């Protein structure tokens, strides 16, 4: 097929994260999408071994006009090869290898290295971070901005390699509690993911540890949800609801031409409002 | 007309803070991937708009099968793509003498069993938090609260003020003003898992501890409201099984299988994190 489908696919990893919201980011698409004539065809893979299945159908069987990827690597396969093939898209998330696309994300250094900040102003001296499976490009700008976080403003971090944002809930809330039952404990902690921090603070509060007192925590969250119950979590909201529309607009865009230097955005860090100053 | 290999699910933009949405997607499409079907997701944005989606896709022709949710016991929609033969399954149970194919989850049953683990629990004051009233699935939770507050010998702490649609901060400022009066509930039973968290935040902030000075019993769509609340007595929806089943019932329909046959139901299962 060839023609013009009026088809935008979606593209999802089945594996995502308990309090992704998902659907928020989905909603934001189509809310785009509604002053148009296209429809919104989502299509799943289920892991990294098949990650390259759904594009290369897209591709092979033409079934669509742009695509929305997410999970970007630097050196994105997918990336490279819907650029060669002339596929638009646009990625939640940025690739590194030289090729200029649509795309949008979410501040990940900034947050990172912000965090860092708001736990050295809680007096705060050991700090560990939660990070990403190592091979998406969001690791790395977590990564980096914690890093520089820890030089810049006078503290030391607290070594952690057990356990990744990806790492089953269960177990998170299992090496929570062991890590403070340890003499050599941090006091503060970095999620980098909203998900995480809810098992991690289980871990905690099932090992006395006081949150806000004995130890503090920095979380993301893709909605407003770790304050109802836990008040004292240091929150910074990621707008999945605005990533989607952001995503639809540039997409949209690139089908009429746009160049993709033109269609990218970062949106930056925000405190959460239920979050203590 | 002609064979389109969509399936259109049509969902409301307003949903829940913990409706774990793409859960219940990912359920349909698991099962469309051994098909040829594409899912194409088609929102609308309120109650007046609910028929739009449903028009513009027999206007167009644009899917073989739909699937809806929020279910109405007198459905319009149920009725229009009944009379229009469109394929179609609800998420949800209508009451109007039409057969079609549906996956629902048993509230009343759970309502029903919610109360007896309150009473259990020694609570003798229950007040329930209902969706609005017009949606089938209220009334199939209020029915079963109402038999168990007579089986189970305990009375009924009235409530009108708030809805499970009834926004969180609201809620939360209701929870609050509730514990402080001297008339109050010592138990809760919740038909929304986000309800539940805006709840307990008002319960907290009014020094009550959840457990001992009042008991909740909660429906959750994912297992996630006993990591930081534990006490929490918490029954699962399986949102991903109903995905599934929905798919699977669309599937048949689409080829011609009587709708009698497409029809389940599933039970409440106490959550393994919940106490015992």
């Given at each position: 097929r060839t023609g013009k489908t009026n088809v935008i696919a979606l593209v999802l990893s089945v594996d995502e994260e308990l309090m992704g919201f998902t659907s928020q980011m989905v909603f934001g698409?189509?809310?785009?999408?509604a002053t148009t004539q296209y429809h919104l065809v989502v299509t799943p893979h289920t892991h990294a071994k098949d990650s390259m299945v759904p594009i290369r159908?897209?591709?092979?069987?033409?079934?669509?006009?742009?695509?929305?990827?997410?999970?970007?690597e630097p050196n994105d396969p997918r990336v490279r090869f819907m650029t060669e093939r002339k596929m638009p898209f646009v990625t939640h998330g940025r690739s590194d290898m030289?090729?200029?696309h649509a795309y949008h994300d979410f501040d990940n250094e900034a947050y990172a290295y912000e965090a860092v900040e708001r736990l050295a102003q809680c007096g705060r001296k050991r700090i560990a971070i939660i990070v990403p499976p190592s091979r998406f490009a969001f690791h790395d700008h977590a990564r980096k901005g914690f890093t520089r976080g820890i030089r810049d403003f006078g503290v030391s971090e607290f070594p952690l390699d057990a356990i990744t944002i990806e790492t089953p809930l269960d177990k998170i809330r299992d090496f929570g509690k062991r890590l403070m039952q340890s003499d050599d404990r941090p006091d503060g902690i970095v999620?980098?993911?909203?998900?995480?921090t809810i098992a991690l603070?289980?871990?905690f509060e099932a090992a006395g540890v006081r949150i806000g007192k004995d130890i503090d925590i920095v979380s993301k969250q893709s909605a407003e949800f770790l304050n109802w119950i836990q008040p004292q979590i240091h929150t910074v909201n990621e707008d999945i609801k605005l990533?989607?529309?952001?995503?639809?607009?540039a997409l949209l865009a690139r089908i009429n031409g746009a160049p993709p230097e033109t269609l990218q955005s970062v949106s930056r860090p925000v405190w959460?409002?239920?979050?203590?100053?």
């Open positions: 698409i189509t809310e785009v999408l159908y897209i591709l092979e069987t033409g079934s669509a006009d742009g695509v929305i990827i997410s999970k970007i030289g090729i200029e999620s980098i993911s909203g998900s995480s603070v289980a871990g990533a989607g529309r952001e995503l639809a607009k959460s409002s239920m979050a203590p100053k």
